[PDB]
Amino acid sequence: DVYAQEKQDFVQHFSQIVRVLTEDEMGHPEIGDAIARLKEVLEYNAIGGKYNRGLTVVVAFRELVEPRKQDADSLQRAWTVGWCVELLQAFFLVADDIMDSSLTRRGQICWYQKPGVGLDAINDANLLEACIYRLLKLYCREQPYYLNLIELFLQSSYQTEIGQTLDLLTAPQGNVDLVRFTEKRYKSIVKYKTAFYSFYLPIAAAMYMAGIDGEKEHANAKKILLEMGEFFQIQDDYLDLFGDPSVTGKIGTDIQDNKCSWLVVQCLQRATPEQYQILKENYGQKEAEKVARVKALYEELDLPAVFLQYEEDSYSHIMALIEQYAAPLPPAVFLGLARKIYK
Amino acid sequence: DVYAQEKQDFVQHFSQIVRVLTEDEMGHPEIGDAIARLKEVLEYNAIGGKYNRGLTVVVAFRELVEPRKQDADSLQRAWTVGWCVELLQAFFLVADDIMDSSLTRRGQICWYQKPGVGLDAINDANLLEACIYRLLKLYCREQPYYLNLIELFLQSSYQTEIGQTLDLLTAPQGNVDLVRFTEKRYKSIVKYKTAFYSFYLPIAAAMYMAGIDGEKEHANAKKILLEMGEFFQIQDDYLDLFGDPSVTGKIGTDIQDNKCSWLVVQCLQRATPEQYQILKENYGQKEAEKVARVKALYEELDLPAVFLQYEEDSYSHIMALIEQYAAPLPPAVFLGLARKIYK
Numbered sequence A, B: 001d002v003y004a005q006e007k008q009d010f011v012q013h014f015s016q017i018v019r020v021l022t023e024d025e026m027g028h029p030e031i032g033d034a035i036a037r038l039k040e041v042l043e044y045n046a047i048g049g050k051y052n053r054g055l056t057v058v059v060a061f062r063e064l065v066e067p068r069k070q071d072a073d074s075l076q077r078a079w080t081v082g083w084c085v086e087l088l089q090a091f092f093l094v095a096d097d098i099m100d101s102s103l104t105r106r107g108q109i110c111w112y113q114k115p116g117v118g119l120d121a122i123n124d125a126n127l128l129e130a131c132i133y134r135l136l137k138l139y140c141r142e143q144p145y146y147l148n149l150i151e152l153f154l155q156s157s158y159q160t161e162i163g164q165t166l167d168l169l170t171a172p173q174g175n176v177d178l179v180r181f182t183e184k185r186y187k188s189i190v191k192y193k194t195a196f197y198s199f200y201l202p203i204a205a206a207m208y209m210a211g212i213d214g215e216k217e218h219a220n221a222k223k224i225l226l227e228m229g230e231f232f233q234i235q236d237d238y239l240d241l242f243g244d245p246s247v248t249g250k251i252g253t254d255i256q257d258n259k260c261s262w263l264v265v266q267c268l269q270r271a272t273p274e275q276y277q278i279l280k281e282n283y284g285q286k287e288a289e290k291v292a293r294v295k296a297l298y299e300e301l302d303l304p305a306v307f308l309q310y311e312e313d314s315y316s317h318i319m320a321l322i323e324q325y326a327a328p329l330p331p332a333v334f335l336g337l338a339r340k341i342y343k
């Protein structure tokens, strides 16, 4: 209902993102070709998403301002920062898909896989990163929050990259790494790699855009948004395998990439010594017979219905945290976020 | 003499960089392994350089402060920001070497080529990027310049990436791109891709650290530092081919990568229609017989002595710009920089 509303409005505003970010032509005719390529990047990589995070910034902003203070220019900034989160996202997936060897994403071939692109993808990725802060200076350079956002976006990139380093240290190509797959490792991973940016960031951004910068208020918010954070990825890793690729818009590479997924983690808790051995022979390998034998094993331990279980268990716990912790904020923020991620 | 002095002092201070950047252990035991890997990155990629830029920040700072204001903590910040530029550098080369397919750099194998690393190099690279701003908040969070530096480092990353996009758009693997190799393109390239960060940045950083933030003072400085900027890369591209690999610490990939180098540019101005054709058949290809036939052609048009010519021509012009433009600043800044890059 509530994201469903302002989505289209959120997406039209992407025409101006691109306009502004590439309005340097007669001033710098030399670099016009870099700026075209830039456009081409943004069109391809910032678009197709569920735009949930970018939206989340916008919805949160409305919710947290007295509409007597939501003037035209405040909403200008409101969805600008929205778009910045989308860029951040886009930055991450473009790099992520080289690193994770992915084939497709958002219903089309990965940027880095297009012929004529390949590893220029890396430079492209960091460009999106840059555009984030380019906008900030544009639309927020004179706000009292301008600096808090910059630090937020960065403090959040770092955290994402720390997560990403764990992801990979825990998931070497070649090395049977079942010992490494503990739930203690896992919670750490999705915390840094997912929760902070896909949740704390967007919300937090708007908190600062609403003049709300108390450490304790941010801390509570954080407490809540790291769970939603966390479930979200267990759902990502679930969908990776049992999800519909015409609906996820991507193909899963978790078994092949020897990844510390929720699944392999639970699988291990419930392994008969023999089973441990089947998985051992099969996990972390390109071969489809092996990837298949594992998918069977996950089904052989009825993990999909276990995921259905945690989904309820977590919905219920996330909801307790909202009650315990939302205030002084309007609980519609978090609720709106939960509706949009639970099934 | 002057860089030769504070180099060793500059390099000892790298023990504390690593200490500080990895002093989160008992506070966050979960992520200790990411932070080890981080250490490993920094050790490998921030070290071995000529540390010229990092130094340049430090030397410039002394030169531009009354030593009654150069207290212990000002020099703490002074070389911290030094190190930040080194990180920025390191960020760029780690990504650069994947993108440019380089084999070696700084007298050893490229990070991304080590076995067990490969494309995790990409995540590693952005980590260095992050550390920059991690330090800033650490040692400069309470300074009046703190924000100007952040914007400088970013405004400079973007510019570097724009350059880098030109680099690559101008240099597709496969496509004979001799038409594209004009000196108008070239000046644009090395301007964004090299001059801004290896020169304007370090100096400018210290200008702001010395409380000097007038647009016109920065503008003049910029005018001067973009030439030094520019020559520096023509020397890089010269050395790429005719340089000593036990002294550059790297092997050149400009012909192989179909790059818009100073050389191919000059080569083209002086081409007999036939010659244009030899180069045509040979440029932009892995094959060593072809790379060889080109190196011959550059020697066949006595370009090395032409480089010796521009070197003098540019030394002389750079020096005119210092006279025309240094003030109110101490001309020893720029001079010190020129001594250290001219032969």
Ligand SMILES: Cc1ccc(-c2cc3c(NC(P(=O)(O)O)P(=O)(O)O)ncnc3s2)cc1
Pocket (backbone or CB within 6 Å): A091, A092, A093, A095, A096, A100, A160, A161, A164, A193, A194, A195, A233, A236, B122, B123, B126
């Ligand atoms: C450098 C870098 C650092 C972190 C990422 C992240 C990817 C990602 C993400 N993507 C998912 P996917 O896009 O479903 O593959 P992952 O399982 O690869 O992590 N989902 C939630 N958080 C993150 S953070 C991507 C690139």
Ligand SMILES: Cc1ccc(-c2cc3c(NC(P(=O)(O)O)P(=O)(O)O)ncnc3s2)cc1
Pocket (backbone or CB within 6 Å): A122, A123, A126, B091, B092, B093, B095, B096, B100, B160, B161, B164, B193, B194, B195, B233, B236
């Ligand atoms: C993403 C990115 C963007 C820019 C770079 C740059 C590499 C580089 C550089 N490296 C030299 P090299 O390190 O001698 O190969 P290049 O000819 O590849 O540009 N020298 C001067 N400026 C720059 S900027 C590297 C990575």
Ligand SMILES: [Mg+2]
Pocket (backbone or CB within 6 Å): A096, A097, A100, A102
């Ligand atoms: Mg992935």
Ligand SMILES: [Mg+2]
Pocket (backbone or CB within 6 Å): A096, A100, A167
């Ligand atoms: Mg991943």
Ligand SMILES: [Mg+2]
Pocket (backbone or CB within 6 Å): A236, A237, A240
């Ligand atoms: Mg995933």
Ligand SMILES: [Mg+2]
Pocket (backbone or CB within 6 Å): B096, B097, B100, B102
């Ligand atoms: Mg290179």
Ligand SMILES: [Mg+2]
Pocket (backbone or CB within 6 Å): B096, B100, B167
């Ligand atoms: Mg290059």
Ligand SMILES: [Mg+2]
Pocket (backbone or CB within 6 Å): B236, B237, B240
């Ligand atoms: Mg070069």
